[PDB]
A paper describes a structure:
Here, we present [name], the first novel structure to be solved by in-vacuum long-wavelength macromolecular crystallo­graphy on beamline [name] at Diamond Light Source, and its subsequent high-resolution structure solved by molecular replacement. The protein crystals belonged to space group P412121, with two molecules found in the asymmetric unit. Hence, molecular replacement was needed to phase the high-resolution data. The structure is composed of a novel domain and an FMN nitroreductase domain. Each molecule in the asymmetric unit consists of 16 α-helices and 17 β-sheets (structural figures were created using PyMOL v.1.5.0.4 from Schrödinger). PISA analysis infers that the dimer is biologically relevant, with each molecule containing a single FMN. The N-terminal domain contains a portion (residues 7–86) which, by visual analysis, supported by Phyre2, possesses the same fold as the leader binding domain of TruD, the so-called ‘peptide-clamp domain’. The remaining residues in domain 1 (87–194) form a second peptide-clamp domain, but its binding site is buried by an interaction with the other clamp domain and thus it is unlikely to be active. The peptide was included as there was evidence that it may bind to the oxidase; however, there was no evidence of any density for the peptide.
Cyanobactins are a family of ribosomally synthesized and post-translationally modified peptides from cyanobacteria. The only enzyme function remaining to be solved in the patellamide cluster is that of the FMN-dependent cyanobactin azoline oxidase. The oxidase converts thiazolines to thiazoles, with some enzymes also capable of the oxidation of oxazolines to oxazoles. We have reported the first structure of an oxidase protein from a cyanobactin pathway.
Residue numbers in the entry:
A (entry chain A): 3 to 222, 233 to 469
B (entry chain B): 1 to 222, 231 to 473
Write the structure that this text describes.
């Protein structure tokens, strides 16, 4: 009914003696002794030349009408699972990217109604194809003919109200497209949620493109090839090393504030004592929150991770990709500047001294925290992306941000148990930070911030 | 270079013309010219129109104010290029618009024509206002596509193999589309100068990034106060979903303040536990757990917020802007005094509310959690965390969703530590299908959606000595 059907590229088709197996990651379909007409039709689906009506004829022609009716019936189950692509050749191919899949071809009325390309639709290069995608679609459209890119260019260039009945004459003149191809193309674009039929929205207005795209893509064995580039702790930045104090955790296991007290007492504190936080306090704080407790090689892993660490917080895949850079404006036995915390040696390493660039990071934290007392220490959290990205496809960055939160709450509770003044910070300029430190922004970048000062009695 | 392209003022720039002064104005910078001479004024007007070259603009100034004034004009104009005030165009094809200060366009060496190149994987086309725009998180420019023939060129570039060499492949582009070789060379020079092309066709530590991750990172890691206009639509707690309400137990927190596990013990003992006891977690345990982690402790109106937030709550975890946009849906496969199904936790009344009973759809959410935690024991309870986006999006521009995800983490660690103090079996779950969940519950995915998951069962006691 209107499109050429074909199998998803994600689908694999193991053909053998006696059996035919159709296979995705999720689902498996075995056909034992499939009849010639059905086999012929399954081959033409792999080619992609044909309509449902034509595929049904192939089955019936050899296996009879009941077999063909069964085939069409059972084939729409596979459409639901996202196994069937719909194409308008030679222009475009819709590929499902989700289960529970459906294409409602719209009413003829669309031709006289004002429409527009969705503000969430975008074109980009996927592998060796141009693809049209949207966080609002269950499909990605592979652009086969460059003349489709010309059509989208004109749609985006049009005014708010593009009406196909009055504006299609331009598209058909300059580009050598027939009216029936162009009508089928628009029907697919509407069916795959790339078009707006109401130019107005209601609770979709509130979303920004980059947020909805990220949410969509993250809410659906690999080898650690670059293990030597992204080791379990970062290679030392500076030859200067300031050793930090180590508290007696066995003593604290019985002496420390209770978990219930820590949770119920926890506040964000932005006003500080005149006496800055001490180096001894910073040292105890970091040991309790972020140290390397052990180093182990997992004896089995086929992913070839090599060495990994255990730390005082949980972390997706283990791996522990975050680093901590204490930016010191005021501290006990510490000159002002940017440091890097080294969690295995339990040491600080100077990264940069107090310049105008480093001061503006402290100003941003101060401004972000309501201008309610000059920061003493700001902990800038960074992520070494290569430590995690190899393992996680689309969810790596969403894991990282949940790790920042995991760390924030750990900082909050330990700070509360030490009578320090904690506050998370929502924003920060990563390009400014990457420039101050030595960092390639693609390799490592700030993803979180946390202010820490001495609290008043 | 300013000679290879035609010049215009950024659309973000505004030009207040008055009897004796001329003011050029962005959000950041302000330039006042007192008694500017006719030739300079004429040239500044044509920059606002666009479509003239540096050479032509210099002629306009010189024609009326003399050659020295024109030389001065061209010299001083490259200061404005640095501030992001000047667009560079290859008419009638494309116009590069700066989106950042400290702006520079290094037109590449002729060598690019014989070198293998490719469109950046981070370059993307989308509809901005009434134009098609090419953008990248790796660029300081956005290119407005003026001619559809540029979209055809990009379509072919993306369709090409790893190694597209202009010297050997440009013949196709020039044949089918009516473009001249000099237009096409200028276009490619601009695309290279604005970071839309790769000259090392292989990358190094940029390969590892997926488009949606790099875009989100760049936009979230970069004025009058906003108003909470839809406060009534997004109140401090969600309106009750079901009439059935199962009340939950409330522990003595004053007693726990002294009797509970220490914070150090909780942190040092915390483990992810995926294997469970035969006895499922009880309703009394679930109730104590949620009270300690996620209840509304107080309701207050802030007496002088100008943002008109109205009522807000305090809870056992911190939250960006306060506001507390998250909800918790306990999905119960096995529990003490609770039939299997999906519930919603109500943090002010401290009650559970049935959302959906045990269907094949609800079972597949439990299967996904089981599969995600290694298939190491059937889940007992899975806590699905959701976000009511309108509670937060009004206040935060580009960072709202990154705050939400940090809140999920904040909650995960709170769940982990309390579970550890209660001797329960906790584990965070990295992924989950929001569409499937939104369908099972009653939810519009644009209004509210799952953003986190956490499994919780009864732990074994067990030994090792
Ligand atoms: C954000 C986040 C997501 C996680 N996702 C999963 C998951 O999908 N599956 C799983 O088995 N464990 C998950 N975990 C638990 C980690 O795998 C665990 O912290 C680590 O592998 C081992 O540390 P632990 O045993 O000290 O918790 C997650 C943890 C965090 C912080
Ligand atoms: C992810 C996150 C980001 C935050 N960002 C900021 C911030 O930018 N500025 C600020 O003053 N407080 C920030 N906070 C602290 C909250 O404002 C605070 O938790 C809440 O306003 C008051 O609750 P509390 O005093 O119990 O923490 C943040 C908290 C979290 C969890």
């Amino acid at each position: 009914d209107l499109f050429t059907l074909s199998f998803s590229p994600d689908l694999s088709i193991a053909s053998e003696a006696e059996q035919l197996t159709l296979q995705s990651k999720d689902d498996r379909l075995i056909l034992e002794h499939p009849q010639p007409g059905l086999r012929t039709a399954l081959e033409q689906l792999k080619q992609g030349n044909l309509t449902l009506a034509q595929l049904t004829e192939l089955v019936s022609e050899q296996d009879g009408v009941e077999a063909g009716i069964t085939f069409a019936s059972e084939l729409e189950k596979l459409v639901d699972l996202g196994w069937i692509c719909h194409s308008v050749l030679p222009l475009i191919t819709a590929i499902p990217i989700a289960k529970d899949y459906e294409l409602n071809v719209p009413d003829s009325s669309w031709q006289t109604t004002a429409i527009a390309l969705s503000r969430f639709a975008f074109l980009h290069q996927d592998l060796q194809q141009l693809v049209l995608e949207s966080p609002r679609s269950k499909s990605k459209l592979v652009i086969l003919d460059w003349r489709v890119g010309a059509v989208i260019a004109k749609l985006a260039q049009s005014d708010r109200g593009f009406i196909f009945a009055t504006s299609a004459d331009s598209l058909l003149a300059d580009l050598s497209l027939e009216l029936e191809e162009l009508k089928r193309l628009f029907a697919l674009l509407i069916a795959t949620q790339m078009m707006d039929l109401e130019p107005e929205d209601e609770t979709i207005t509130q979303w920004k493109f980059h947020n909805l795209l990220f949410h969509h893509y993250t809410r659906l064995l690999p080898v650690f090839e670059h293990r030597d580039r992204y080791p379990y702790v970062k290679p030392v930045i500076s030859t200067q090393a300031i050793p930090l104090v180590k508290p007696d955790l066995t003593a604290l296991a019985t002496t420390d504030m209770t978990l219930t007290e820590a949770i119920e007492t926890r506040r964000s504190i932005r006003e500080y004592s005149d006496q800055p936080i001490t180096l001894a306090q910073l040292g105890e704080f970091l040991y309790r929150c972020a140290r390397v407790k052990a180093v182990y090689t997992l004896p089995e892993d086929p992913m070839q991770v090599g060495e990994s660490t255990t730390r005082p917080y949980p972390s997706g895949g283990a791996l522990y990709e975050l680093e901590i850079y204490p930016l010191v404006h005021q501290c006990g036995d510490l000159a002002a500047g940017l440091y890097h915390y080294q969690p295995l040696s339990h040491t600080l390493h100077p990264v940069a001294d107090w310049t105008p660039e480093v001061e503006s990071l402290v100003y941003d934290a101060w401004r972000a925290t309501g201008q309610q007392s000059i920061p003493q220490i700001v902990l800038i959290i960074t992520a070494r992306f290569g430590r995690l990205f190899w393992k996680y496809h689309d969810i790596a960055y969403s894991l990282i941000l949940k790790h920042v939160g995991v760390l924030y709450q750990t900082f909050y509770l330990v700070a509360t148990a030490m009578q320090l003044a904690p506050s998370a910070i929502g924003a920060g300029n990563t390009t400014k930070f990457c420039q101050i430190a030595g960092l390639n922004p693609d390799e490592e970048a700030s993803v979180g911030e946390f202010s820490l000062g001495a609290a008043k009695p």
